[model samples]
Target: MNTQQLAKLRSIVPEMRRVRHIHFVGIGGAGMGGIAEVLANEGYQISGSDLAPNPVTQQLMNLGATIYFNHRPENVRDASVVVVSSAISADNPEIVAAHEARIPVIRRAEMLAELMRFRHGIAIAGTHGKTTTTAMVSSIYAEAGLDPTFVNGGLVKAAGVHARLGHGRYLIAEADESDASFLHLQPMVAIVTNIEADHMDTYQGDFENLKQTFINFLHNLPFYGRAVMCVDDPVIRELLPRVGRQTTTYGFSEDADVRVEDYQQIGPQGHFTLLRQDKEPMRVTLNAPGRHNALNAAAAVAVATEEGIDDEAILRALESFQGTGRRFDFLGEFPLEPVNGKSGTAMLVDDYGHHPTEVDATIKAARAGWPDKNLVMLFQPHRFTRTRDLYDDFANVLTQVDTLLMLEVYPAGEAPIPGADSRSLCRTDPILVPDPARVAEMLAPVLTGNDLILVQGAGNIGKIARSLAEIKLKPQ
Candidate 1:
């Protein structure tokens, strides 16, 4: 059946009538928690267990889901179906117990796919910009009075939550490529921002394999559905011909169907004109910085326009976008005690761009926003595999900052390589620090007035950034 017909039936047909309970292992993860919360709101008896309690878990508990601080076999005792995160191992007690109890065990994406089965799903997929783009589309749809049900990898600050269950036909979500789980989703409309080689491990370290997987994802869209792509990306541009589905292209390229024109960045706000093939060019402005974000906003506009949303709603959504958490998120400026004993202020920015391309774009954004300010960056490498794979590129991009402080790799799980550690990076002066805990202490004395302190990476550096933003730097 078509998605529209299925959605209509599912609205009246209760899939969970016989099975009332759903449990998730590693429920605290951003992706896992969102699904759990949405299921809870659907009146399912939701319960989950995590290694530790987090805000996401707490929020789920507050939403009436039973949460366990520790993962044990008993956690899934009454669950009708058990959902597991990618990080959770097969040997996990709850997973083992679920198998023994004959309860259905499924990956997070499978559950998400079940949720998307009945709705008019809009899946946002890419190596980068997926979360921000998903949030943008959600915001624009909401502004257009669609009130889409959105599940994001990051916090949608405007909604004050990562996921929401709206009573609309749209189910907007971030399609994850980290483990190829996005392949399970057959969304009505799919948005591919850009394709790059970051999750090489998942593709058995084959670049072509990674690229082909994205092609496969686009193929999941039905023949009548459209694929919104970024023509600016050579990879996506190349793959466009291979995608059999209907396509709409968006980018700054002249060939793009929904192209952006006359782009300009003024401080933290980006100003541009959005031009389409047969529609009047609309002036667009975003409170977010960077040309990358301008591309992201353009992608949202393309999707919203295809839905026949009003231009006024699109303008209001893009212009007033509050931004996602940790994507060029501005903390605040604070007083700094200069080495010369003069008073100055340091603008602090936090970002979750761990890949080389992401970091490069962020650094460029910082430079564009404040040309005269000294860019001081405290970066923590996310995983040993990524650091080892992109070591030289990391060193090359990091050297652009005026002052760079390196923290040891966060090592999501992999063991360290011989030369992949922070000490292996080629810096003129030694700035490698092993402990992330002492990063703020190390950075405090070096603060200067008019310095833009950028705390970046997708790791514990966020805590360091928060600590730095709250500190009152006094001359020691």
Candidate 2:
């Protein structure tokens, strides 16, 4: 899943150019939906199935891609190629039929690799900041009138689709490494935000293996390709020297290619000045707070500059970016519960942060954003292996919040591990609730005026955010 494989995929790109029909097994997924949009934009007859429809599914339907509920063998009647996301069950009936029919089944990464061959690709990688950074870069490119084609991991604001098939030469996408999928993309411009231990289910509970995977992902980039690395992370700094000469570093570090200085966070917004080697420093204001975002914005600006884009356009676009869905998404106050019938508490936010460092960063941002409030965090650990490997780390990080509520681990695609669950977390005086509604019910007593409620996780923790909103409205 490196450059060699991508070159091999480049040869297959022409085969798809003449493709009459394409179908996806998990079309509703964010990643799969973006790829589906690309195929549809390229004029391929497309259709797909998902367990349920989402915003992505409805958008595809509007674009004329037929949809279905779950996988069915009969659905692939005219499907010349069947694409599947990591979420797809290997035993799915549609997959079996595709296999039996020899219709050429491929993973999402394979689709992305093939798609990258069609345009000038800018793939954003790393464990954290991939989505936000990709969205920022895409927004900047679009605002600059690049009209760049995009296929990010999440729905960016006002951009109805995660991807846009634009007339511009650039094709931007968030290169995910969750299942080593980032290795599938060989981009002209690559950005690695910061690689940390995440997606434990795939990495078999090893951090070094995850680092090596990222190292190999970089090796996939073309010899002349430019790589943007985060110099802020010690792990990333250690890994940078191993990369090729065509690499640039971004961070608060003095030696970074794009360095940030005189940074300050006032309330929910952040301000920073980017210091590059050959250019004058440029000031940037981001709607999202924290050093994490500053680092991300720096990379976006660096990439934009490398492409001969104006610095003013990059800063303006970064300022206007409201944010991607569920990335520190702030959901304001609803009425207090029926029981209390008093001042309503703000169900402040929902964030897609599963790793320990991410949890810490999100919490820090929340606290700075709501300095006057007491914070109550409701977090669902993502997978069994993550909970098992980083349970203590999660506890230590969660302690930063004023209060804690731990939900049962949500096993997105992996089987449950024995004796490894959210219940294994080491926390004192924390509420344990498995059901979202139950969590909402239990949280009411603790929530009061000016208290920020932070819902955290990469899974169903977001669902509990909705339930908490409901509880605030009803107050019972």
Candidate 3:
């Protein structure tokens, strides 16, 4: 049982790791596809089942993952463990059969934990900015030649993939607190952008429990690990004293460790100077706009600066980042038919911000970036529960737009509450695009030249947003 035996064992297992076949129930999702893709690259029999054909699934297929278009009992035949998404139903045949067959069943975060266990991991958590911050950290590390592995809930548009397996010891990912499943991960550096009351249903409608859950998540880090936090949020600022972890702060506040100063937005670009504890103020020109994005960039810099990442790399990544897909994602300037005998182009952008906080940010970004243009939003509320909980907030924000065309609630599988539909959120006066298929037909008449058109939601509305760019708008 000496060196010869160890060498032989290592030779048989090239990565010297035990192989476990991992099957995902909903691999089309960013969380599932990303984790599965990384796991597959780490040497495992990766398989997935999804009814929807998506870019995520195709990438997994390219990586040699066994994919079944539909869920079946036989799909889990070779699996050591079946990872389930929250979106999957309880009585799904594959899951029920897996439970009966004695194969281990796990959540997406558990498998994410296995990958982070042996690496220098960074987990970004919060209601917003998780994907963008994750992308920023990944970009900064890669720019510094650290080649960190990253998994985001949305596509890091620069990489074109939601996740990547880098040949380095660093792993960066988003810690989703929606289902409160991030407890499975124990990362070295954790960034909490801002915690809001969006996912209260998971906590049984208690905000205290939601607050405590994030506290517990930060505690998952080891005694030596650090927490990078944004103190701009009142909730986070109030709870800061309670978290015992060694931490650093970032944001516009003067007290922040990595503070932002002179923040300004000039048309899809953010100009700011980041001032840290001892380092010189680093002036940055981020490609994406909005105060929210500048804060996200600050959070990324807080992590990088604390870890001794060079200013050049951090600034370079911020400069080069085109932004994540669906997060203030710019499509293009499309032609609009003349109104009042004047013709001009409108800016078309797609975003996946369904939460009230996120939607407000995107709206503000569009407003600031194009101050001269009319803010016309083709809004689609994501889930009924969220719409019900934040009904007033949605109404207030949606009213900010010059024209609010409300699409029916996507209802990610929720029974419509008595009054929790898009019609209720719109208050009956705004335009309601009930038939999603006829979105363009309904939208054409509402358009004016030089409008800032923001097609926003987390649902399948993204499909039609792209087609709007090619449509001929009605002229007045």
Candidate 4:
């Protein structure tokens, strides 16, 4: 092409010139909504369809994006390209119409990949801690004056938004590994907290396939790019030799390049010493609880330190971090009204940890943060396949709680699996209340003082938790 032609091409915005309008199916989803919001903020004409209007959809609408409550053929009639969440089926009216019109039909992650193409992308992956780690990286980058654009599956509490469009070059995001869609993101920096056997169905129930996919994701990075990983996880440690890119390892492990030492959890705060190679050992205090969170902070610090961000900025970010929504979110303490001769104050916590490892980590954090308080957990299983695959693990961990309440599986588009229902998980006669609405009623009768009530799962249990939070508890 001629020099003048090249200059003229560069003058036109890539996304604006390629596609004037972008439509999304199932835009209410966390992953989809975040991308739509960021694109909308970038002066793109965005429209989407979802079954219902949610907070995420409302936020998108507020950003000048048109939102349709229900899907129809006319939804994507005028769209330049149609983006669909994993939850949306191919036969959906909007998707079908998009194909009929010969418009580009793409997955949510593909759109995210396009967004990250020209920017400096920092992608965080792993089965657990993706949202928290992503938020942590965004926090550290922002503190260092980078003003990074970030898209996370969960709400970044400090920013009060799940995604943002920033002026700076950095674009930090949580890379979803559930459907192997993260492969599309070719980021400059990637962080893998750990790898586990969750979402096995996507890989044909083969663990090796799942592990190899992660390898491919790491290899997508350029030779100069870095892979920040946690060595504490056996899977990550095992795959370390295969990651061809320059890598930085973090954990409590002795050989970790960024190791945490002298770790302690005082109430809801986590204090630790970060010992980095060739750098002064720094005293780090994280507002979030749990040793897992300490490792997450360590991962963020490693990336920030490597990118030449000031240590003071990193320290300040970790200190004042407000934490993400549903990751050990403390709702409030409520005094329980007397019911069947039971009454007392209980600390309520809501978390979005559906996997066994995540649930185990959340429980460990709760115990470490409030050792004196009895752990009362109301866990709603997320998917039937996950429940079926990790049934014993769930049972073993759930049994650790002083009191446990098992709600029926959330069934995120999965059918029920035999022997994976809530009843089969009851080893100690714990409450098996399938209906979330009846939980507070049954729970009131069993309430006692000095109890930490943790409502955990990746489903509608959040609604139940918020409902419980709104109740007026009588004084003792």
Candidate 5:
């Protein structure tokens, strides 16, 4: 979802706008709910509308928010200012109502900026891994006993919520680039994990535009502020020369300011050595798996190191890190009934990785930790544009799985493109499951003992992962 009809409300300050009752157009959205929750705790009136009910909507209601199960003009009738996520369309009735009433309609980032206005803000921006990296930094800060206000639309397992309003000098958050609204943020510290060509449409189909947008985001940091980036990504490494701020680089690259070495995943844990300039090398045992996760932890470590956080606190934070939601999330291991006189357990893990690069990392992490387990993936393609753009890349990675059950592409409101659906991806020889609801039923016949069942995607398929818990695999 790219930026859509973002009203240039930057001219109005939060105090000047003086919103009394703030409303979110799509309040149950990833970032929307978190922001509403924070503002609700601040004693501001919060109300919004969304389709149907979910945990976030219910939580918001529990926080004294007025939630409407459906969108309508009356929903925003009394909203002083309406906040909207990237997912909200321009024609949404609530948005139209706000406009008709001459109310301010602002993007979610603008609202986040207001929240970070007085605090030392830490914003994580990247094409991938933004949520996990943001969660890692927040966890490290909390472990150091700095209760920084943090907002990650993705659940932070340790905190048990998407966001927290805290009393500290820092505010940590995941900055969104999909819509290029991240440009609205002005942060004291910024982290760019890795930049790729995911949301090209947002950049006018120009990769350079996307790269420059990230550089511009980093430039928002004050002269005294610093930019933390992953040097291993060629795009970011190439753009580093153009970023005119204090910068710290982290990755497997030898010249990185903070370097990770010999990362290996043992089961669900990643072990690596972290080296920084003019400091004793620190050995890190990360609670998450994969080299990508190791890099995420290294990014957190770099930010902590720059902020003068002690090594003990950093190490403890990494080791005790309760992982964020849907990133190689291990649900449980189920016992497989006897098949050819063999009975063992198969593990069920959930991941929100949708892109080819992300999916590959998840697959590698699973392979590294469970070498002998058959990698059976139930994957749903995220968007039609993504499928059409990275068709070959998706095919290449999906082929690596021992067994693959492909679900239809989650349109995300985009019209379907020819040759970009799950059936079109049949060239990879994945068993196509037409109905997501029937995945577990279809999966029963494909599974054997010692199979690693990975339910992977970044859409409504997350609900499917939880549904699989009810799967009862009968003895063959």
Candidate 6:
């Protein structure tokens, strides 16, 4: 809806005194962690649990919040509200207990929706660039003297906290279209970076289904709600006119209301200008990498401008965003295990990518960063069903890398399915090391000097990044 209608929707937010304990199931997730973190900072009683703990989980635990590994009914004993992710099944013990208790249990999106009640909701939605774009938007809002509450899908480096509660009525959220969750929001402002068909497992591999969901999400807002889109993507270009909200387009497209005029994509860094109609171009230098990042910065600029941010503040925030962890995290120096102690060009990098499009873009970006470096990608497939469904596309993207190392698929909660495994994706004698220690052992000798190693995937493949980072650059 438009700005006026969005304010009317905020009239429904209950007073702060009514909210007691807000608990989370599958709270260890990057997105959920953000949600929990923000709420905790907002002076709400926060408690959460996951099946296991990791660095991100530990971070929450260190925040003086209660976090557990078990999913027992007692965990929610005194909770006033419960929030669970899409990944959490209805049969999950914690979920079951919450339902049995007759407590108010809301889906993750629903909790986000609730938080959007008191804030000028800015939803950054896309198949890709969601985390970075949302983080960028948050940073820009912060620069405008607004401490916008943020719920990013990753550990954003721009702000140490994944989520933060601010005094202003601005909330920045990474709108997920995976389950068409973005459609549930009636946001004051919505920013769509781009749209693509990558979540094949959810959309039945139909591109049109993905497009329709995005259109529906745009339509959910009030007629006066502001919708921002990138004209660079053909799909977003076509869907822009179909929305009922007050639409503003951004990108390199000449017709966009805010278009990129001057752009530069250097190695691991980018800078661009948002050319506003009938005004001077707003120059932005990004600390992050990738061409997609340029578009992300543009989206943030649009959101910031809408909120009355000056050009100076937007420039500062855009320059301050150093990127989130794991999207393109650095592992170690090059020339690992050099001959006679002489350093080589071998390097190590890590990325969290599960889909074929994600994989292809990451590899190409790596190549663009280090053209002479021979790339070795270690990939761990996540979820048997996803691997089985997108096998061919995975192969196509992976074959572009110089060499490959394969890890057993991370089943997560899904039981193994027949014929769905990682071996089929490998072209060589694929090493199957499920254990992190064993994988580290196998990689030590072969991951020699001059090789550009990339440890990739959505699961625990990142464990290898920590293992590999310990090794010093030496001669073989």
TM-score of 3: 0.94
lDDT of 3 by residue, 1-476 (tens): 23464345334334424446888998896599998887777667899999898888888898899888998899999678899988898899999989989988988888888788778889999988899889889999999998788989988888888998776778899999999999999999999999888878889989999989999999999999899999989999999998989989888888888888898899889999988888777899898889898999989988898779988988889998878888888887766644223477877789999887888898888888678887888988988877888888888877777887888888877788978887676773488887766776676676677778788898888887866655544321
Q: In order, what lDDT does every prediction score?
A: 0.86, 0.81, 0.84, 0.87, 0.86, 0.77
* Candidate numbers, best TM-score first, in rank order: 1, 4, 5, 3, 2, 6
Per-residue lDDT of model 2, residues 1-476, tens digit only: 23464355445344455579999998987598888887776667789999887788898897789999867899888788998888877899999999899899989988888878867889999888899999999999998998887888887876856887766778899998988877888789899898777776688878889888888888887898888988888998998888873998988988988999898888778988988778887888897888788888999988998998987888889888878888888777655546345575555688888889888999878776568888888888888867777766876788887878888888876799976766667343777876665555677677777677778888867766766665554534
Which runs of model 1 end up more than 4 angstroms from their true locations? 1-13, 338-341, 426-430, 472-476
List ranges where model 2 is wrong by over 4 Å: 1-15, 335-339, 344-347, 426-428, 470-472
lDDT tens string, model 1, 1-476? Answer: 33564466467544755778999998997599999888877767899988878789889988898888887889999789999999898899999999999999999999999888878999999999999999999999999998788999998889988998887878999999999999999899999999888878789989999888899998999989989999999999888889999999999899899888888889999999998867988899887889999999999999998999999999999889988888899998776654335577778899999999999999999999689998988888888888888877888888888988888889877888878878888452437677655565677656666889888899878877777666543323
Cα-lDDT of candidate 2: 0.81
**Residue 435 miss distance in model 1 (angstroms):** 3.9
Model 5, span 1-476: residue lDDT tens: 01121122122213324668999988888689998887876667899888857989988999999999888899998888999988888999988888999999999999999888877899999989999999999999998999788999699999889998775668899999999898999999999999988978888889988888888899899999999999999988888889999899999999999999988889999999999999988889999999999999989998998999888999898998998889888888887763323588888899999999999999999999889999999999999988988988999988888988988889878899888888999765578888654666678778877889999999888888887765543321
Candidate 4 per-residue lDDT, tens place, 1-476, comes to: 23454344345324446788999999997589999988886767899999878889999888989999888899997888999999888789998898889999999999999888778999999888999989999999999888788999999999999998776778899999999999999999999999888888899988999889999999999999999999999989999999999999999999999999999999999999999988989999898999999999999999998899999999999999989989999989866544334466688899999888888888899889688888888888888778888877888877777888888888877778878887777752588885655666767656677789989998899988888777643221
Error of 1 at 104 (Å): 0.2
Q: How many residue pairs clash in all the candidates, one count each?
A: 0, 4, 0, 0, 0, 14
TM-score of each: 0.95, 0.92, 0.94, 0.95, 0.94, 0.88
lDDT of 6 by residue, 278-300 (tens): 56766677877666777788888
As for lDDT, the candidate ahead, 2 or 3, is 3
Q: For candidate 1, give the lDDT.
A: 0.86
- Cα deviation of 302 in candidate 5 (Å)? 0.7
